[PDB]
């Protein structure tokens, strides 16, 4: 009797949820009774990268936080990661359709929840490396959870960063300068990405206001292989994403502390929580 062991014969595919770094996530129904009363689960499998999937399963299995998507089990030399299903999807799907319901106060409550989940990850000595609104799952109108731990790496004890080797598919427009220049990942690099995720959240993930769309306006969209170097050059000059429309300056200042060039000059997740909470009450 293993509640974390899912039999393949009972896992019925419903549809695709997402595709990414050599993996795919699908909506399935675990139906051991065969009457469609079974629980719906998000199933991550591979499209050799079994080693990365296995490390991701080991990371998520030992993470327990209300703002972190829940591990449910595995389906087994192939393996599948079984997670809880959040029907609202991510901030990217949810925010454009719920602008009327999600006011400034609620956006700040989501930012606090994202910081809490991230601070918990950082206390376990992990760097997420893919913090974006597309990876923030919606449990309800009052709660969000960090999903997709596909790029998550451990920082060694008595070390401040993780050195990245495979960087071909890096979300460069969400990355801190030390990540773009030296392929070094600090907890402070996740703080930088949080500032960008906060920007998306305040713009309700509008495609025309996206960090990529906005940065490509600043540096040019026709530079190809020279994009990253032009982006690094722009950041070095002190240029950042502009204040979102209807965003109060006090929220903008918190965001800009995420974007200090030097990692050691950046705000912490705990300072962000304090800052947002002072604005809330
Ligand atoms: C309306 O469009 C969607 C609705 C949805 F409900 C979902 C969804 N995705 C997951 C999911 N993982 C998937 C990844 C996706 C991209 N970011 C990181 C999560 C997990 Cl673990 C648990 N429930 C989930 N629900 C996705 C959707 O389109 C992206």
Curated annotation (Swiss-Prot):
It comes from the Eukaryota. Residues 11-280 form the Protein kinase domain. Autophosphorylated. Phosphorylated by TYK2 on tyrosine residues in response to type-I interferon signaling, leading to its activation. Phosphorylated on tyrosine residues in response to interferon gamma signaling. Dephosphorylation of Tyr-161 and Tyr-162 by PTPN2 negatively regulates cytokine-mediated signaling. Ubiquitinated by RNF125; leading to its degradation by the proteasome. The modification Phosphotyrosine is found at residues 161-162. ATP binds at residues 17-25, 44. Expressed at higher levels in primary colon tumors than in normal colon tissue. The expression level in metastatic colon tumors is comparable to the expression level in normal colon tissue. The active site is at residue 130. It is found in: Endomembrane system. It is linked to Autoinflammation, immune dysregulation, and eosinophilia: An autosomal dominant disorder characterized by immune dysregulation, severe atopic dermatitis, and chronic gastrointestinal inflammation. Additional features include asthma, food or environmental allergies, as well as poor overall growth with short stature. Belongs to the protein kinase superfamily. Tyr protein kinase family. JAK subfamily. Tyrosine kinase of the non-receptor type, involved in the IFN-alpha/beta/gamma signal pathway. Kinase partner for the interleukin (IL)-2 receptor as well as interleukin (IL)-10 receptor. Kinase partner for the type I interferon receptor IFNAR2. In response to interferon-binding to IFNAR1-IFNAR2 heterodimer, phosphorylates and activates its binding partner IFNAR2, creating docking sites for STAT proteins. Directly phosphorylates STAT proteins but also activates STAT signaling through the transactivation of other JAK kinases associated with signaling receptors. Interacts with IL31RA. Interacts with IFNGR1. Interacts with JAKMIP1. Interacts with SHB. Interacts (via N-terminus) with IL2RB and IL10RA (via its cytoplasmic domain). Interacts with FER. The protein kinase 1 domain is also called the pseudokinase domain and has a regulatory role through the transactivation of other JAK kinases associated with signaling receptors. This is Tyrosine-protein kinase JAK1. The gene is JAK1. The chain holds residues 865 to 1154 of 1154 of the full protein.
């Amino acid at each position: 009797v293993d509640p974390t062991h899912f039999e393949k014969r009972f896992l019925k595919r419903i549809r695709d949820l997402g595709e990414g770094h050599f993996g795919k996530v699908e909506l399935c129904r675990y139906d051991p009774e065969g009457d469609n009363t079974g629980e719906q689960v998000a199933v991550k499998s591979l499209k050799n990268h079994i080693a990365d999937l296995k490390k991701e399963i080991e990371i998520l299995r030992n993470l327990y936080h209300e703002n972190i998507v829940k591990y449910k089990g595995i389906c087994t030399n192939g393996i599948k990661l079984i997670m809880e299903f959040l029907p609202s999807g991510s901030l990217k799907e949810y925010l454009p359709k719920n602008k009327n319901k999600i006011n400034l106060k609620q956006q700040l409550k989501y930012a606090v929840q994202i910081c809490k989940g991230m601070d918990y990850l950082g206390s376990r000595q992990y760097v997420h490396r893919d913090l974006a609104a597309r990876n923030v799952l919606v449990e309800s109108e009052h709660q969000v959870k960090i999903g997709d731990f596909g790029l998550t790496k451990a920082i060694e004890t008595d070390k401040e960063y993780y050195t990245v080797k495979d960087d071909r598919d890096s979300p460069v427009f969400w990355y801190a300068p030390e990540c773009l220049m030296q392929s070094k990942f600090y907890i402070a690099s996740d703080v930088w990405s949080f500032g960008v995720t906060l920007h998306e959240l305040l713009t309700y993930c509008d495609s025309d206001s996206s960090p990529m769309a906005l940065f490509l306006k600043m540096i040019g969209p026709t530079h190809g292989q020279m994009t990253v170097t032009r982006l690094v050059n722009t950041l070095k000059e002190g240029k950042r994403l502009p204040c979102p429309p209807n965003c109060p300056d006090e929220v903008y200042q918190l965001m800009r502390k995420c974007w200090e060039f030097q990692p050691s000059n950046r705000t912490s997740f705990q300072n962000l929580i304090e800052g947002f909470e002072a604005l809330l009450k």
